[PDB]
Symmetry: C3
């Protein structure tokens, strides 16, 4: 009769897939950069041609942190004894010795530079990514007609990253936590992707930058995880008689199985006749509206319990199917089963919820008399 | 020849019994309140009639912290998706859905409202409290002739709560740590209670509010634990020719097996002809004198080792019998043995100690010339 | 092909040997002093004749921290109930009782007062130190012709103390981390000692107090660990036509197997015709130059990985032989093998490294045009 919460320990294994480490522009300063991810530490640095390299951060000589070193030429120089390591992981020079042991080779991670971002491939099995597991090129990025990224990040301590992934099915929380108003909500999972289609409006009683200065903006969203960690969200807003195109990133990487970094950011297509500056300000506003919602999630996650047996209502999204899909990335590729990857679609009938949320928004308006 | 300290790991099991969570007045503000106890988290809230309810804090939908929610009607509303939970643990409404799953029932803890306090019943076996395991009604509380509580609390990190319980037999430390002067000291353990009878005086060399502005006040104390965690101490002071009646609470709850909350507080009987205000100031002073002693204990506990094999002198209280009594609350009721619960009495002959403490207080007086 | 880092968990066992706890002058204030070492806590205090005593800090009565007590006579008085413990570990008085249980005896550690320092003997097997395992008397210490110690300390969190010991063979890091310029480098390990002989010069491009105000000072160093934790370094500098004699301590004690205290300090022989004050200022300057290098090591250690399989170059010192020697102190004396203790000598041919470091220092000079 009393329902109890069940929760297994978070896996120690990290998701197999592409993970965005951040913006190319932040990494292309010619300095080394430290990334604590997947239970270890990595070093990111640009070579003299500007290509980004990602190595295990721990120097194979005496364990020094390469990310606290310095770039010299096309090699990263260790701060402890200045050995030089290139983008292939090869030690290219021990500056105080004649020869280099041939076995001096560390791990260079597989990278992708795309969409103004740096992605790395994680796989505990150690295989390269298949050609068909990739990150889509966002068509508009880098054209004159779109802004650069307004980009933000948040460090979440005390939660496993499944907590963020669960949101792809959580229609109700976009009302309570993101202060939007969902009207249509549909999920489709298939292969290594998970998609949410939503149509929402702003709420009258709460003001958010995501509405682009129209409290009743309709927003059409197609949001897809391409693998375990990286979502692209294509949005179109009808705000004050205009149609605005926004592309929002929602992504993360695990620091450990109890800590992750959440990065999110927006580009906006320049409306006819608006300057670069005005468009950049629309991107920034949209990103700040997203921030508000994510900071609320952070408070939810900070205080909540993990739960493997959530009790779902009739108006809930397909959490269990999402989780079964997500599990593919935590088993060897050989152990993947059809029920993880088979096409699964579910649409929530929102008519109940909309009735209720309208009453709520209305009597929160009456709340001025 | 070298004596070594032995100490088993602190139990993971929490004491079976009534635990005071705090003052009703603090909980009856219509807001939810978070309590981290017994290795979990609880939510306390008043319904619309003012009755207090205590539930598991973790929402059975998706794990949300109910204690960061809001009270609506007679239900607590989860901050994540606003499901409503009543005092019986029943989900009364999913505001955006037509129906509620019948299996939506969480744990409502058994409570007691008494003595201006809220108590909850803990039992890992999951049974209700027997009729004869209860908290005494303090006769004077809530009458015109007694004050309300002057109440204080302290959070102790890095100790198991047995450390506070041990004090019920520790005559000597009331001199060194509490700066009183014990003259008579007797213990009686029986059933689920443990009692200390003491007569003490203030020390000349040290000034304390517990002496009510008479450095030589005699104090008669009857102090009893009613179960594992909650002590009521009935005190009568003869200070400046008056007889003052005080009732002191000393209680705690375990946060984890290495952290606990200590709450203590006093009511004073109004002397003939004194105002409510004057009496409240006597309660506050008494509570501040107790605080001094407890803050010293905190320093003792912060730095000490746990010890299962204490080496006792002739003037020590019956630590081992106290601990055997205390063990009853950490075994199933079926496994309780007669030697835990049998009447056991021991009186310390204080004549040695008094001689010594007088010399000490005297030569600390001479300490002005 | 990819080389991986291997690292076993740090031992839980602590090194057998003499460990310096600090300066006698700091301990001879008549107050008790707390030392967290070897996974436990110790109390240091002077008796009424000024002799230092070291006991287990945890009182055998009820676990009180003796190091937060007070010295009375030749005994330390516990802060909880004022029992008195002498330098032999014997309880000498329970001030409020007639008798003391004969079995009231705690652990007095074996100490040495020498070189203005206090050393204690650690051995998990519980044996006394053999006559031939000792700390050398530094001839000059306490004579008119030498200063007292300029002494410094650093607390290192998140590293095992093997990290500091490894430096005895690490020629290259004296250039990159200590900003000296090694010209000759030789190790000899034998018995319970490990020695580094080095000749170095200052670097032009970097200024350090260790050069005594001559940027090209030659320095001759004989540095020896006498057991696992304590190194004496005899130095002679030829700076601005003078010959300066310095003796530098480099030592530590383990707090836990992941935290240690590093203490280091210098005495200087008074040059003909210089005052005590001028000599003390040379000691202080030398100590501050050492500090600079050690603070850099702290940054190296803070960020590095532990590594049991370091990959060594032709110009590396004999790390593996050093570690095998060091292992003697973590096995029972009976289990020591000849390969740990046999004489082993290795000299690095520095000619390669010197060429390279000169180029580097030179083009860092050109770095002003
Ligand atoms: C990116 C996102 C979060 C996590 C997730 O899993 C799916 C989505 C898609 C909808 C986005 C939302 C973030 C907040 C957005 C911008 C709104 O305020 C309305 C639409 C909504
Ligand atoms: C409440 C208490 C503490 C813990 C315990 O176990 C038993 C007692 C009873 C005596 C109280 C004492 C607290 C300090 C008091 C008020 C004094 O200063 C003299 C009498 C003494
Ligand atoms: C004490 C020490 C550190 C750890 C070790 O293992 C061996 C030595 C001996 C050489 C000392 C060095 C400390 C820094 C010194 C003073 C210099 O700047 C040049 C010589 C060098
Ligand atoms: S640890 Fe990297 S060069 Fe030595
Ligand atoms: S987690 Fe409580 S309503 Fe969803
Ligand atoms: S604990 Fe040291 S005297 Fe009681
Ligand atoms: Fe969210
Ligand atoms: Fe106490
Ligand atoms: Fe060093």
């Amino acid at each position: 009769e009393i329902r109890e919460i069940q929760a297994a320990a978070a896996p120690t294994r990290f998701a197999r897939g592409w993970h965005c480490l951040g913006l190319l522009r932040d990494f292309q300063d010619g300095k080394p950069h430290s990334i604590e991810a997947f239970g270890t530490k990595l070093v990111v640095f640009a070579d003299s041609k500007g290509q980004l390299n990602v190595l295990d951060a721990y120097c194979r000589h005496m364990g020094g942190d390469l990310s606290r070193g310095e770039v010299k030429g096309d090699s990263i120089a260790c701060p402890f004894h200045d050995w030089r390591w290139n983008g292939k992981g090869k030690c290219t020079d021990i500056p105080y010795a004649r020869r280099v042991p041939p076995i001096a080779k560390t791990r260079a991670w597989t990278t992708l530079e795309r969409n103004g971002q740096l992605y790395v491939w994680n796989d505990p099995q150690g295989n390269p990514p298949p050609e068909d597991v990739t990150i889509p090129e966002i068509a508009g990025y880098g054209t004159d007609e779109w802004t650069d990224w307004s980009w933000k990040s948040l460090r979440i301590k005390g939660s496993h990253c499944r907590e963020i992934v669960d949101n792809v099915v959580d229609m109700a929380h976009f009302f309570y936590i993101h202060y939007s108003f969902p009207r249509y909500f549909k999920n489709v999972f298939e292969g290594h992707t998970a998609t949410q289609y939503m149509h929402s409006t702003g709420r009258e009683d709460v003001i958010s930058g995501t509405n682009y200065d129209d409290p009743n903006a309709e927003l059409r969203s197609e949001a897809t995880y391409f693998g375990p960690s990286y979502m692209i969200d294509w949005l179109e807003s009808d705000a004050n008689g205009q149609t605005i195109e926004t592309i929002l990133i929602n992504c993360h990487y695990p620091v450990s199985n109890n800590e992750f970094v959440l990065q999110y950011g927006a580009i906006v297509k320049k409306l006819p006749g608006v300057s670069d500056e005005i468009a950049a300000g629309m991107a920034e506003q949209f990103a700040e509206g997203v921030q508000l919602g994510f900071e609320q999630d952070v408070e939810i996650w900070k205080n909540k319990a993990p739960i493997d047996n959530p009790l779902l209502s009739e108006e809930d999204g397909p959490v269990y199917q999402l989780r079964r899909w997500y599990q593919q990335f935590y088993v060897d590729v050989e152990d993947i089963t059809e029920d993880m990857t088979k096409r699964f679609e579910f649409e929530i009938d929102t008519t109940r919820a909309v009735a209720s949320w309208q009453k709520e928004v209305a009597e929160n308006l009456a709340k001025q008399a």
